[PDB]
Every structure is written in structure tokens, then in C-alpha cells.
Design a protein around this ligand. Structure first.
Ligand SMILES: *[C@@H]1O[C@H](CO)[C@@H](O[C@@H]2O[C@H](CO)[C@@H](O[C@@H]3O[C@H](CO[C@H]4O[C@H](CO[C@H]5O[C@H](CO)[C@@H](O)[C@H](O)[C@@H]5O[C@H]5O[C@H](CO)[C@@H](O)[C@H](O)[C@@H]5O)[C@@H](O)[C@H](O[C@H]5O[C@H](CO)[C@@H](O)[C@H](O)[C@@H]5O)[C@@H]4O)[C@@H](O)[C@H](O[C@H]4O[C@H](CO)[C@@H](O)[C@H](O)[C@@H]4O[C@H]4O[C@H](CO)[C@@H](O)[C@H](O)[C@@H]4O[C@H]4O[C@H](CO)[C@@H](O)[C@H](O)[C@@H]4O)[C@@H]3O)[C@H](O)[C@H]2NC(C)=O)[C@H](O)[C@H]1NC(C)=O
Ligand SMILES: *[C@@H]1O[C@H](CO)[C@@H](O[C@@H]2O[C@H](CO)[C@@H](O[C@@H]3O[C@H](CO)[C@@H](O)[C@H](O[C@H]4O[C@H](CO)[C@@H](O)[C@H](O)[C@@H]4O[C@H]4O[C@H](CO)[C@@H](O)[C@H](O)[C@@H]4O[C@H]4O[C@H](CO)[C@@H](O)[C@H](O)[C@@H]4O)[C@@H]3O)[C@H](O)[C@H]2NC(C)=O)[C@H](O)[C@H]1NC(C)=O
Ligand SMILES: *[C@@H]1O[C@H](CO)[C@@H](O)[C@H](O)[C@H]1NC(C)=O
Ligand SMILES: *[C@@H]1O[C@H](CO)[C@@H](O)[C@H](O)[C@H]1NC(C)=O
Lengths: 53, 106, 129
């Protein structure tokens, strides 16, 4: 809804929209990480070599 | 550089093996050639992609330390020539040849 | 694929050297390497230098001060400029194609040398008087 002649100054560096958006996705992406496999028996004495050719 | 036997003697029918040694062969890839006297060299062992043993047809080659063995299966009397291993340096700056190895067929 | 060298036969000592190698019947002449390799009688082979069609050349560093390899691509014939001929350089000289196949980005070094498949005529380079 377009408005007529409202002198309003922004401040993109100081708002809580950025602060919440940073808080939302980290919590949301951690929420997808919950039901997956933990899978920490593999932290063992791994031994390797170069790929042979 | 590289290090080869000067000459290898074998009867026909057996398996002759030539050991190209040298300091750059710790890392880099080894070529092989054949040259008849009075004629041109002939590439005899080339390579495919890296994890593919190059190419295995009539000849083969293994690697152990700074030594590379040139396996010749089924020696007859027609392959009499002089043979050459070739590589480059690990720094990848210049290309050297082997000393030269004569095939001696009984 | 054909190839043929080009030579004068008899060269005096302390003069220069002008050789070339003409290539035909090559569907992709633009993506190989082109090299000179010489041979002394009863001796091993002796790499000289190489050229690629970008213009990048390398050389044998011991021979580098007297040699130069240049190139025409319209006629697929690359040249050879050796200076200061000595009698120890009397031998059998060769032009050769060193093939390269490609498994990806050329600018990232996803290529490898196939190997030197095609060898030249040979020329009795005689440095005498
Ligand atoms: C970002 O931008 C980048 C651009 O800057 C871009 O990089 C490009 O990436 C792609 C892939 O990532 C690169 O593509 C590769 O190209 C290779 C070279 O292809 C060219 O050369 C062939 C060869 O043609 C020769 O032969 C014919 C006759 O048949 C002649 O007419 C030719 O002129 C030429 O002849 C010369 O060579 C002869 C042989 O030595 C000489 O005797 C002769 O004198 C001649 O001088 C050309 O044919 C190509 O043109 C078209 O033709 C084919 C025909 O089928 C088309 O299929 C093809 O698509 C072309 O349109 C072209 O000019 C290819 O080798 C390479 O393909 C290999 O890999 C793929 C994937 O693995 C395979 O599917 C494919 O089959 C090939 O595998 C064979 O070869 C490799 C060798 O390493 C082996 O590993 C593999 O096992 C297989 O080997 C088998 O077959 C061999 C031969 O068949 C045999 O010898 C083996 O022993 C074995 O049996 C691939 O396509 C491209 O070059 C890059 N470009 C640059 C500039 O970097 C990048 O992608 C971009 N990235 C993004 C995200 O956009
Ligand atoms: C910021 O950007 C600027 C410009 O945008 C950069 O400056 C440029 O930097 C380039 C590399 O640092 C430099 O290119 C070189 O220039 C010389 C002379 O012009 C040229 O000879 C070089 O070509 C060699 O190097 C390239 C890449 O390494 C190879 O693809 C090329 O084939 C040449 O390498 C060959 O010779 C080497 C010699 O030691 C061998 O070691 C090497 O293996 C290779 O041999 C193979 O290729 C041959 C050709 O096929 C073949 O015969 C042989 O048998 C082997 O197969 C290279 O083009 C630019 O000159 C330079 N420009 C300016 C104006 O200075 C700058 O670096 C950037 N800044 C920073 C901080 O990086
Ligand atoms: C090279 O390695 C592959 C797999 O690593 C193997 O199948 C092949 O037998 C090997 N060839 C030689 C000659 O050692
Ligand atoms: C080029 O040589 C090939 C053999 O490598 C041959 O099959 C072909 O016919 C020749 N091309 C022409 C145009 O004669």
C-alpha cells in the first residue's frame, strides 16, 4: 500500500531483524540435526597411505 | 640421472628383465622406448590416467624403491635392439634418458 | 600422420644450424607437443627442447645457450636454431610428436603426456670441413 510523502530515515546497521534472522536459522538448522545418527565410534587410530596408482 | 645394466643376455623363450634405476624414480613416471639400429625410436610403453597401471599388453613393469624392472614376456630373436628408460626430474624442469641397454638374444 | 625433416647435410664447424620438420595428416595438430631429440652414433638419446603452440618453450639447460626452437602453424612445420656448431655434435637428429591427452581443465593442469608416439626421419648431421 503505497504512501504519500513520509520522510522516514532507516538504520540498516541497527535493527533486530538481522539479529533474529541470525538466531532463527542456527536454531532451525540444528533442529534438523537432532534425529540423525550420532556416529562417534569412528574416532579411533586411523592409519592411511597415499592412493596407489 | 638414470642407471641401467649395459647389456642383458637371454635365450629365446624365457623372460628377460631390465632394471632401470635412478634418483628421480622415487616419484616420477618412467617411459620406455625401442630403437632399431639405423632407424627411429619407438614408444613401447605409454600411459593412461594415473590410477590405471598405464597400459598392459605385451610388456609390463613393476616398481620397487628407486628401481623399475622392465619385464619382457616371451623373448624371441626378432626383438633384438637397444632399449631406453626415460623420465624427468621431480622438480619437473628437464628430461633425461637412460644410459642404454642392449638386448642379447641367444 | 606423416612427418618429414629438412636438412643441409654438411655443416662447417663454428657456424649455425637451421632445421625444420613438416607435419601433415594431423586432425588435431594444435594440442600435441613438438620436440627435437638428437642421437650420437653408438650412444644414448639426447633430448634438446620442446615447443607448444601457446609459445611456451623449454630446453636442455646445458645446451640452452646455443639453441632455439621456433614454429610456423599455418604450414605445420616447426624450426630449429642451433648456433656455434662443433664436431662433437655430429650425429643423427630427430623431430618427434609428444602427445598429451586431456582429462579436464587445461589451465589447471588436468592433463598428462601420452608419450612420444611419432618419430622423425633422422638426418646425418655432419659437422666437418
Ligand atoms: C571450464 O572451462 C574449461 C575450458 O577451458 C572446461 O575444460 C574442459 O573440460 C573437459 C572435461 O572436463 C575437457 O574435455 C576432455 O577433452 C579431452 C580431449 O578432447 C579433445 O580431443 C579429442 C581427441 O580427438 C583426437 O582424435 C580424433 C580422431 O578420433 C581427431 O580428429 C582429433 O582431432 C584428435 O586427434 C589428435 O589426437 C590423436 C590421438 O593422439 C592423434 O593421433 C592425432 O594426430 C590428433 O592430433 C577430440 O576428439 C575432442 O573433440 C570432440 O570429439 C569427441 C569424439 O567423441 C567428443 O566426444 C568430445 O566431447 C569432443 O567434442 C576434443 O577436441 C578428452 O580426451 C576427454 O575425454 C576423456 O574423458 C572423458 C571423461 O572421463 C571420457 O568420457 C572420454 O571418453 C575421454 O576418456 C578417454 O580418454 C582419457 C584420456 O585421459 C582416459 O582417461 C579414458 O580412460 C578414456 O581413454 C580411453 O579412450 C582413449 C581414446 O578414446 C584411449 O586412448 C585410451 O587408451 C582409453 O581406451 C574430455 O572430454 C576439455 O578438454 C577441457 N577444455 C579445456 C580447454 O580445458 C571445463 O569443463 C569448464 N568447467 C565447467 C564447470 O564449465
Ligand atoms: C597476477 O597476475 C599476473 C598477470 O595476470 C601474473 O603475472 C604472470 O605470472 C605468470 C606465472 O606466474 C607468468 O607466466 C609465465 O610467463 C613465462 C614467460 O612469459 C612463460 O614461460 C611461462 O610458461 C611456463 O609456465 C606455465 C605455468 O607454469 C606453463 O603452463 C608453461 O607451459 C610454461 O611452463 C613450462 O616451463 C616450465 C619452466 O620451468 C616448466 O617447469 C613447466 O613444467 C612447463 O613445461 C611444460 O610445458 C611446456 C609447454 O607445453 C612443455 O614444452 C614442457 O615440456 C612441459 O610440458 C608462464 O606463461 C606471466 O609472465 C606473468 N605476467 C607478468 C606480466 O608478469 C602474476 O603472477 C599474478 N600475481 C601473483 C602474485 O601470482
Ligand atoms: C595396477 O594396479 C591395479 C589396481 O591398483 C591392479 O589391478 C593391476 O593388476 C596393477 N598392475 C600392475 C602391472 O601392477
Ligand atoms: C592419414 O594417415 C592415416 C593413418 O594414420 C590414414 O588412415 C589416412 O587415410 C591418412 N589421411 C589421408 C587424408 O590420407
Amino acid at each position: 500500500i503505497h504512501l504519500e510523502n513520509v520522510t522516514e530515515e532507516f538504520n540498516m546497521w541497527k535493527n533486530n531483524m538481522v539479529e533474529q534472522m541470525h538466531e532463527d536459522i542456527i536454531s532451525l538448522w540444528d533442529q534438523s540435526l537432532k534425529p540423525c545418527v550420532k556416529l562417534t565410534p569412528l574416532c579411533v587410530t586411523l592409519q592411511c597411505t597415499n592412493v596407489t596408482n | 640421472e638414470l642407471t641401467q645394466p649395459p647389456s642383458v643376455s637371454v635365450s629365446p623363450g624365457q623372460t628377460a628383465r631390465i632394471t632401470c634405476s635412478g634418483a628421480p624414480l622415487t616419484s616420477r613416471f618412467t617411459y620406455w622406448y625401442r630403437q632399431k639400429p639405423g632407424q627411429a625410436p619407438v614408444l613401447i610403453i605409454s600411459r593412461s590416467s594415473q590410477r590405471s597401471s598405464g597400459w598392459s599388453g605385451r610388456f609390463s613393469a613393476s616398481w620397487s624403491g628407486t628401481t623399475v624392472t622392465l619385464t619382457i614376456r616371451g623373448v624371441q630373436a626378432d626383438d633384438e635392439a637397444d632399449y631406453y628408460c626415460q623420465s624427468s626430474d621431480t622438480s619437473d624442469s628437464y628430461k633425461m634418458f637412460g644410459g642404454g641397454t642392449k638386448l642379447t638374444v641367444l | 600422420v606423416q612427418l618429414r625433416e629438412s636438412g643441409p647435410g654438411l655443416v662447417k664447424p663454428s657456424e649455425t644450424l637451421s632445421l625444420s620438420c613438416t607435419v601433415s595428416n594431423d586432425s588435431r595438430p594444435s594440442d600435441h607437443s613438438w620436440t627435437w631429440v638428437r642421437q650420437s652414433p653408438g650412444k644414448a638419446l639426447e633430448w634438446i627442447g620442446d615447443i607448444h603452440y601457446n609459445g611456451a618453450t623449454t630446453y636442455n639447460p646445458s645446451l640452452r645457450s646455443r639453441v632455439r626452437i621456433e614454429l610456423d602453424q599455418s604450414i605445420p612445420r616447426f624450426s630449429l636454431k642451433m648456433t656455434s656448431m662443433t664436431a662433437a655434435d655430429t650425429g643423427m637428429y630427430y623431430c618427434a610428436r609428444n602427445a598429451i591427452r586431456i582429462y579436464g581443465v587445461v589451465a589447471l593442469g588436468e592433463w598428462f603426456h601420452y608419450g612420444m608416439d611419432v618419430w622423425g626421419q633422422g638426418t646425418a648431421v655432419t659437422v666437418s670441413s
